[PDB]
Design a protein around this ligand. Structure first.
Ligand code: HEM
Ligand code: HEM
Ligand code: CYN
Ligand code: CYN
Ligand code: XE
Ligand code: XE
Lengths: 190, 190
């Protein structure tokens, strides 16, 4: 997979392993979540393909959003919309499968920079908008969540065991997007 | 109410009214939410009091969190933990009642600065930690949400009409916290 530099970042995560403990705590993540995430994962793996479509159906309906993929002239750099689509789809099962250990943190950091102007579009060789406005990152917590509820219950799951899956996806996202802000935030305020 | 400077900000919201349209869209907020928020509101008003306790029960259980209220020596500046508690409780019904118009935006901005080192603790005359690390703001999306589900259904509401209330609270938070980041983010990256 092209540009998937997981574990081969080799520039350290300027946030430590203790940090994720305190943040996990803020986002109320308990080991009792760890089970249902992995479950959630195995719920989604097979179905993954349809998920990217639903989600791409969304970004695609909004211009102020799709713009963030468009070449300098304002039309979607698709060699760039098939290379992200790939890495992101690696990510969903990475959220249901990697243990949240240091290298997972090395790369949470990397994905911030990839949204940031520090390292947006370098990976994928394309010419496109300079930076992604952080406001939308935060925003993407809701759709990336809501749109997931339906999928979690299609492979047949009781209405309260599913709730624990969604509830786990919810927390897992907020936590991530939380760490991504580093290159966005003025030093000392993160 | 002391320090509740809603509508008497008189320094403009450096984000405009168009901005909230595009962001509302990212956070998937439709007029069909506008109804259930106000509903949610009238669900919560009476119950408000207990809500601050539950929530204060939480921040209070975590030191890395409560620290953000403590005097320079490291013990909770309570004249500061009774003055916030007040303004915040004005806020819940402000989220269920103000229409999201320009002055509502003037003050969303204000509340960022109040979390930021630009204007943290000035309002309330206390001596305390310089800045609130933005990572926790993002994080506070989950508890401020999860802890709300139970309350929304206590005043007797069917299991699918309630879901629309929570779903509306969810979106309404992400949106807010989204705007608060302005003083935190390096200029041009917001
Ligand atoms: C909930 C917040 C978001 C999540 C979870 C998310 C997810 C992802 C993932 C997993 C990747 C690939 C990372 C990898 O290399 O493995 C990615 C890249 C990318 N995403 Fe996001 N995304 C979010 C917010 C946004 C928003 C709001 C936009 C604007 C439409 C956006 C546009 C992009 C772009 C342009 C890249 C390419 C990075 C580069 O330039 O190299 N993302 N995203
Ligand atoms: C979901 C995100 C959050 C929400 C919705 C929220 C809510 C609020 C509200 C409504 C106020 C009063 C605003 C007013 O003046 O009317 C406030 C103030 C305050 N909150 Fe937050 N809060 C969040 C995140 C946090 C976090 C993570 C902390 C750290 C424990 C924190 C600590 C404080 C402090 C220290 C103030 C006082 C501002 C000052 O210094 O004047 N908040 N918050
Ligand atoms: C990212 N979509
Ligand atoms: C703010 N609690
Ligand atoms: Xe998704
Ligand atoms: Xe709350």
């Amino acid at each position: 997979i092209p540009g998937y530099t997981y574990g081969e970042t080799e520039n350290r995560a300027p946030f430590n392993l203790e940090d994720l403990k305190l943040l996990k705590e803020a986002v109320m993540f308990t080991a009792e979540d760890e089970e249902y995430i992995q479950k959630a994962g195995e719920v989604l793996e097979d179905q993954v393909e349809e998920i990217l479509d639903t989600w791409y159906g969304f970004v695609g309906s909004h211009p102020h959003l799709l713009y963030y993929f468009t070449s300098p002239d304002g039309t979607p750099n698709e060699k760039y919309l098939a290379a992200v689509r790939k890495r992101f789809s690696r990510w969903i099962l990475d959220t249901s499968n990697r243990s949240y250990d240091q290298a997972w943190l090395d790369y949470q950091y990397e994905i911030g920079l990839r949204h940031h102007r520090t390292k947006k579009n370098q990976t994928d060789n394309v010419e496109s908008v300079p930076n992604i406005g952080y406001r939308y990152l935060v925003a993407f917590i809701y759709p990336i969540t809501a749109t997931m509820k339906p999928f979690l219950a299609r492979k047949g799951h009781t209405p309260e065991e599913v709730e624990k899956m969604y509830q786990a996806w919810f927390k897992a996202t907020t936590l991530q997007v939380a760490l991504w802000s580093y290159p966005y935030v003025k030093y000392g305020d993160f």
